[PDB]
């Protein structure tokens, strides 16, 4: 269901999450964006637990 | 710089990269989406 997905994306604010990811990518313009995204999400996880 | 940004996104196929992570995200609907995405880019970044 597109509907299960749409509700999950809304509750977790995934649009804001992608938006923030894009801003960081555009600020950093990393050589390895997959490595940079991995490190960014790890950083966010740590902050969230803090 | 905006033009620097669009060019980066184009060159690194960022739209495709992120769309595929969301496809995987809606398949799993994980309890912890940031942990899931971290592991997904880790996997991608090993394949």
């Amino acid at each position: 269901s597109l509907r299960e997905c749409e509700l999950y994306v809304q509750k977790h604010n995934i649009q804001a999450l992608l938006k923030d990811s894009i801003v960081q990518l555009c600020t950093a313009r990393p050589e390895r964006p997959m490595a940079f995204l991995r490190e960014y999400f790890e950083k966010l996880e740590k902050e969230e637990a803090k | 710089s905006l033009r620097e940004c669009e060019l980066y996104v184009q060159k690194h196929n960022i739209q495709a990269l992120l769309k595929d992570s969301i496809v995987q995200l809606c398949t799993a609907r994980p309890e912890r989406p940031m942990a899931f995405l971290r592991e997904y880019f880790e996997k991608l970044e090993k394949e």
């Binding site: 749409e6 992608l18 938006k19 555009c26 | 669009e6 769309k19 969301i22």
Partner: peptide, 23 residues
């Protein structure tokens, strides 16, 4: 603000894309 608006629109586009690819 230009970079923020671009990220906001791209985010919306990628999400539409993805949602009409898982269905």
């Amino acid at each position: 603000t230009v970079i923020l608006e671009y990220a906001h629109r791209l985010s919306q586009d990628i999400l539409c894309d993805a949602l009409q690819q898982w269905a």
